[PDB]
Amino acid sequence: EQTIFDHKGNVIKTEDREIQIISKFEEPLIVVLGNVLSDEECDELIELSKSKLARSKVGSGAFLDDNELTAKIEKRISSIMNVPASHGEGLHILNYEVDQQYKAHYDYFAEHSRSAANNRISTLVMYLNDVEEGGETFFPKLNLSVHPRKGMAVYFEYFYQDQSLNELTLHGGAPVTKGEKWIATQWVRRGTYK
Amino acid sequence: EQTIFDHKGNVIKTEDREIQIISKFEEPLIVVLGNVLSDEECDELIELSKSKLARSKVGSSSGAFLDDNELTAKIEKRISSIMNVPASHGEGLHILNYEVDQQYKAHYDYFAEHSRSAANNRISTLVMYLNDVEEGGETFFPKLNLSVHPRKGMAVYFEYFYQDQSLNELTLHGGAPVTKGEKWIATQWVRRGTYK
Ligand SMILES: [Co+2]
Ligand SMILES: [Co+2]
Numbered sequence: 001e002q003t004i005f006d007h008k009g010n011v012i013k014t015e016d017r018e019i020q021i022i023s024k025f026e027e028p029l030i031v032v033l034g035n036v037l038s039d040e041e042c043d044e045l046i047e048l049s050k051s052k053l054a055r056s057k058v059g060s061g062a063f064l065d066d067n068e069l070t071a072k073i074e075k076r077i078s079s080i081m082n083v084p085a086s087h088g089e090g091l092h093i094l095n096y097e098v099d100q101q102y103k104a105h106y107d108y109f110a111e112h113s114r115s116a117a118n119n120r121i122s123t124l125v126m127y128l129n130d131v132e133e134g135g136e137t138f139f140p141k142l143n144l145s146v147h148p149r150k151g152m153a154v155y156f157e158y159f160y161q162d163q164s165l166n167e168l169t170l171h172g173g174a175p176v177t178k179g180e181k182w183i184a185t186q187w188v189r190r191g192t193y194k
Numbered sequence: 195e196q197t198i199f200d201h202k203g204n205v206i207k208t209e210d211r212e213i214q215i216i217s218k219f220e221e222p223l224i225v226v227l228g229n230v231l232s233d234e235e236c237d238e239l240i241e242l243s244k245s246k247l248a249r250s251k252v253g254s255s256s257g258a259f260l261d262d263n264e265l266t267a268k269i270e271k272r273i274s275s276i277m278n279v280p281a282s283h284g285e286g287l288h289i290l291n292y293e294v295d296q297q298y299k300a301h302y303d304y305f306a307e308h309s310r311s312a313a314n315n316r317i318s319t320l321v322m323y324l325n326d327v328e329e330g331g332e333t334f335f336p337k338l339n340l341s342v343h344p345r346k347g348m349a350v351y352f353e354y355f356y357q358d359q360s361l362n363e364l365t366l367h368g369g370a371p372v373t374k375g376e377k378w379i380a381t382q383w384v385r386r387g388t389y390k
Contacts, residue, residue: 009329009374010343022348023217023226024332026339032217032226034345133203136218143220147204149228152216178203 001165003029004082004122004157014079016072022152025144028165029157032146033080036153037073037184042128044069046182049093061094061185077186080155081122086194089187093128096135097180102173104140107187108158108166118193122157124186132179139171148181159190195361197223198318198353200278208275210268216348219340222361223353226342227276227320230349231269231380236324238265240378243289256298257290257381273320273382276351282390285383289324292331293376298369300336303383304354304362318353318384328375335367344377355386 012019012033020034037045045064054065064070070091078085096102107123109115125137127148137154138145146154158166173181206213206227214228231239242260249261260266266287274281292298303319305311321333323344332341333350342350354362369377 010327010331010345020345021343022345023340023342025219026341131204135204144218145220146217147215149204149214149216 001027001160001162004159005029005031005155006082007080012080014076017076019080025142028160028169029155030139030142030144030146030169031155033153033155035151036076036080037126037128037151039151041069041073042150045073045091045093045184046095046128049095049182060096061092063089064091064093066090073184074186077124081124081186081188083122083188084192086192087188087190089189089193092185092187093182094185095180095182096173096176098176098178101175104138104170104172106158106167106170118189118191120187121159121190122155122188124153124155124188126153126184126186127151128182128184129180131176131181134175134177135179135181136174137171138174139169141168141170145174148183195221195356195358198278198355199223199225199276199351201276206276208272211272213272213276219338222356222364223351224335224338224340224342224365225351227349227351229347230272230276230320231322231324231347233347235265235269236322236346236378239269239287239289239380240291240324242266243291243378257288259285260287260289262286269380270382276349277318277320277382277384279318279384280388282388283385285385285389288381288383289378290381291376291378292369292372294330294372294374297371300334300366300368302354302363302366307359314385314387314389316383317355317386318351320349320351320382320384322349322380322382323347324378324380325376327372327377330371330373331375331377332370333367334370335365337364337366341370344379
């Protein structure tokens with residue numbers, strides 16, 4: 001089966017950054033990526049997420065609000081995921097700490113679901129900090145895990161005709177046992193989502 | 195089954211360097227490691243491999259093993275902390291170069307059961323990327339549908355000392371064709387028993 005992600009070789013040349021292709025699990029496609037966000041961009045995304053400052057307009061986790069930094073990153077992400085940024089839900093920030101985990105789940109919606117009309121097709125999780133211990137992104141049906149490393153990311157997609165491959169993208173966030181974990185997530189839909 | 199590699203969490207703290215645990219495939223265990231070698235250490239290993247000058251000692255495939263010196267000793271000590279086996283079990287740093295239009299055919303690193311070389315068989319491998327490969331050069335595991343792409347200073351660890359031998363045969367691996375540039379790796383093979 002063809003994949004949405006189609007980058008060959010060892011790097012993805014985006015407009016403002018060279019992304020490193022680190023490892024690939026082929027089907028379903030799970031790709032570890034390096035050099036996705038700079039260290040300062042990582043710090044700024046956390047700082048933005050904790051802040052209650054917003055721009056004025058006339059008239060767990062949370063999606064960030066658009067600014068010049070966040071638009072730059074969605075543009076970069078769009079190159080990586082081969083789908084226009086208009087299809088992304090925006091930079092969602094999640095933070096979990098010691099004695100917490102994110103239970104395993106699929107990122108897409110059920111066929112009987114209402115949001116299945118314009119269902120999610122692919123995911124990028126960006127590690128915004130270094131986790132002292134724990135906090136892996138794990139795929140329990142694949143026996144595969146990606147450990148948080150600041151500036152790196154895991155891409156995976158679930159848009160296959162054989163929906164068995166799609167159910168293999170079940171994933172979770174492992175317990176943090178030392179420190180804390182901050183991730184940015186971009187969920188991409190099959191159609192324009194705005 | 196229990197693995198030789200026994201590091202929880204996200205870093206390995208060795209005597210001189212903090213190694214990053216990047217990704218794991220759990221069984222057979224295949225671990226992508228970051229920050230294993232400095233950029234300068236990578237360059238030095240390549241240049242040492244290029245030289246045919248060698249020390250002489252009383253009494254006397256592809257790629258070549260490096261002579262023991264301060265650099266190789268330092269690196270073997272670090273690797274022994276990663277691999278959880280004394281460096282005395284290591285064969286020493288083996289350097290391989292292949293260029294555009296070349297590949298390394300899929301194989302097992304361990305020796306066939308009951309073979310003379312299986313008497314002190316290999317149990318684990320660390321492959322260190324010494325340069326960036328313009329395109330191609332992945333370390334691929336065809337039975338697992340998994341590949342690790344070369345990235346200077348990074349490494350892939352894997353082991354094949356399982357009691358269920360089928361797990362060991364899942365570590366079949368090769369070096370994919372380089373389609374642009376060239377590829378340099380160092381490898382440490384580790385034996386069940388003392389080797390040096
Ligand atoms: Co998820
Ligand atoms: Co090999």
